[PDB]
């Protein structure tokens, strides 16, 4: 009826469909086709119907006699989630939220991957014409159900990407030091021979990633040096190293723009996906601080203040560099949990600040606004040290305040040290036990993202990254089926075996044995008399 | 089979250090440096002697667990060192390479003590840096003390 | 009603009855 | 025109609303009294009593508000005070 500007027909149906699964179902039913004509993907529309209609077992049996399963089920869970906040009846909302289809899909993939791991990975990568020639990966993304990544095979394919074509530690590091392809001819591998082998040794994700940490580390050090002594008056020489740093900073900015702008349907959607990342937000605010401080050389009168701005930006970038250590297997979940507890400790420290303010107020004026204020502030600062310079109070007593100072001091130490600390180990255990798998998901997730980014990162260094972007801009301005079906059949048979197995298991259920035996014995008793 | 044992490796490196320092008497000009080498070797042998206490029934598993957590705390302390370097860098030059460098190093060292000698900053304010110093100080204490510690009890229970 | 222990009890009664009536 | 009056009643009658108002007022009075104790706790010249009496009278008003919240919620005055 909104499009008008029963009543609905296939037109509005396809409209709403393409509205939810945007790239999955762009243009079904090419404003209406011959309704008499038979279907193309019947079971597809069947499962879609049952999903929209919320007919669990129906869609189940439809999926049974269907093809291209895992992706279908992924989309299924996606749209189930879609039709959760758009529900009015609360109980019906929970029912809809009780899909559990992701479990089905994970079961399917675990099953198929339990054999032909290579063919399984291939399946995970195969395009999907049924879902508009698309990638099950992207399907899961649009689903955003992290558990989709929970399977071991997920990490398997991710890793096979990660360690490069030479997948096969510190040996690899020493290799990264000097280009010894002969050492690579002894370490691992998998006239133009040397050129192709160099391409093989350079195209690896971990390779360019170590290159990037090297470059970022070096630029951090160099900028620290520039802030140490090269943040000089507006003589030109001072600007020399300064401009050398700042120009490259702008190059880094261009690299970030590239990584975040040319990955898109809508420029609005592109910028949204960009602003999604918190770390990209850190990058943006860091460059904001740097560009703000860039006014320092403009105003040599404000050169020192702009320098302080640059120092803040330095702190920002320093914190940013720390983002990488989470990539480690063991350190990963640690940093994840650290990120988790970020919110509560803030408010806790706010309360601690309130308490300290109260203590210092109660102490200072009761004891004895600049000279007397600065001393009070110093006493508050020395609270952490615990110097407790009550000499003046003792002299005054030589009195009615020292006892209260001691009482309040003792109880403050008690409350802070005990509660504000031991309270944290509770949240630590809570984030540990199950949120450790949750953060394993989170870590694998950021891991997927970093792997894509490094793969998405051009196989180039920061210096020639400008040359790579120039080549891209110049190129811009200048302007199977049998195997597919075979693996499809493989998946189908896999699904059939899986279901037969599940039901075989359901048959021998001990409770089912109880029920059948009860029926048989009541029958024997009745027939006997 | 010999090089298999880590403790035999400690023995070997200890004797390596001792034989290296044995050049001290050879070069009385380098007698003090060789003596320092011998001091290092002394530290080695001292740590080595500690190997025995694990033989105890109750103390055994304790020392074992201690040996277990040896790897992770190293990297954790490396991260802590990075953070401290960041803090000291952000503080020193923003506040005020030998005389001004030594003072900065001393401030970094006093970080563990927590003296927090922001008197100079206060004088300067009498300013736009004391608030940020306090913010970063507080959050650094928070992150280090809380996480770098409570993270360890998890591995302890494991 | 469907309590498993109740099932045990009812089945025990029925089987003892079958055994007794059989002999 | 009464639409805005009724809508203001709707936006003001909320519990969280008056509650945030109360935390604001208490916070402000804490700060002001802290200031008065800092430098307005002065000798018995009248001016010193000025801010002092301004604080103390309102303190008595707060006392009356507490008496109201705790006295007119009762079967027995004894049960009420209990
Ligand atoms: Ca980024
Ligand atoms: Ca030995």
TrEMBL record, chain C:
Localization, UniProt: Membrane
Name the UniProt record assigns to this protein: Transient receptor potential cation channel subfamily M member 5
Phylogenetic placement of the source organism: Eukaryota, Metazoa, Chordata, Craniata, Vertebrata
Full-protein interval shown: 1068 to 1090 of 1156
């Amino acid at each position: 009826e909104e499009g008008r500007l029963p009543a609905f027909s296939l037109h509005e149906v396809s409209r709403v469909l393409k509205d939810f699964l945007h790239d999955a179902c762009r243009g079904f039913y090419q404003w209406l086709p011959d309704l008499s004509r038979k279907s193309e993907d019947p079971w597809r529309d069947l499962f879609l119907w049952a999903v929209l209609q919320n007919r669990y077992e129906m869609a189940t049996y439809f999926w049974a006699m269907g093809r291209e399963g895992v992706a279908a089920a992924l989309a299924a869970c996606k749209i189930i989630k879609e039709m959760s906040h758009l529900e009015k009846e609360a109980e019906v909302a929970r029912t809809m939220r009780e899909a559990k289809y992701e479990q089905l899909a994970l079961d399917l993939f675990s099953e198929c991957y339990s054999n032909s791991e290579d063919r399984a990975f291939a399946l995970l990568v195969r395009r999907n014409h049924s879902w508009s020639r698309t990638t099950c990966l992207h399907l899961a993304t649009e689903a955003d159900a992290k558990a989709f990544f929970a399977h071991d095979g997920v990490q398997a394919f991710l890793t096979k990407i990660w360690w490069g074509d030479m997948a096969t530690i510190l040996r690899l590091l020493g290799a990264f030091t000097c280009p010894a392809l002969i050492y690579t001819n002894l370490i691992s591998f998998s006239a133009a021979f040397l050129l192709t082998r160099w391409r093989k040794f350079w195209g690896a994700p971990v390779t360019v990633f170590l290159g990037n940490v090297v470059m970022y580390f070096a630029f951090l050090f160099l900028f620290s040096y520039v802030l140490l002594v090269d943040f000089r008056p507006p003589p030109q020489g001072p600007s020399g190293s300064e401009v050398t740093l700042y120009f490259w900073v702008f190059t880094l900015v261009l690299e970030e723009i590239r990584q975040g702008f040319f990955t898109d349907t809508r420029l609005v959607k592109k910028f949204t996906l960009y602003v999604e990342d918190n770390w990209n937000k850190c990058d943006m605010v860091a460059i904001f601080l740097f560009i703000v401080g860039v006014t320092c050389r403009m105003v040599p009168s404000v050169f020192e203040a702009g320098r302080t701005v640059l120092a803040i930006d330095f702190m920002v970038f320093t914190l940013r560099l720390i983002h990488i250590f989470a990539i480690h297997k063991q350190l990963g979940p640690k940093i994840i949990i650290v990120e988790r507890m970020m919110k509560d400790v803030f408010f806790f420290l706010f309360f601690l600040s309130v308490w300290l303010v109260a203590y210092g107020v109660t102490t200072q004026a009761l004891l004895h606004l600049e000279w007397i204020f600065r001393r009070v502030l110093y006493r508050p600062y020395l609270q952490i040290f615990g110097q407790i310079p009550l000499d003046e109070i003792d002299e005054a007593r030589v009195l009615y305040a020292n006892w209260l100072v001691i009482l309040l001091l003792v109880t403050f130490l008690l409350v802070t040290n005990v509660l504000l600390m031991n309270l944290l180990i509770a949240m630590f255990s809570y984030t540990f036990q199950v949120v450790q798998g949750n953060a394993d998901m989170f870590w694998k997730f950021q891991r997927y993202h970093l792997i894509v980014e490094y793969h998405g990162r051009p196989a180039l260094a920061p210096p020639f990254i400008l040359l790579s972007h120039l080549s891209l801009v110049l190129k811009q301005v200048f302007r199977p089926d049998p195997v597919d079906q075979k693996i499809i059949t493989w998946e189908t048979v896999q699904k059939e075996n899986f279901l037969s197995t599940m039901e075989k298991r359901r048959r021998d259920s001990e409770e089912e044995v109880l029920r059948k035996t009860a029926h048989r014995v009541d029958l024997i008793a009745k027939y006997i008399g």
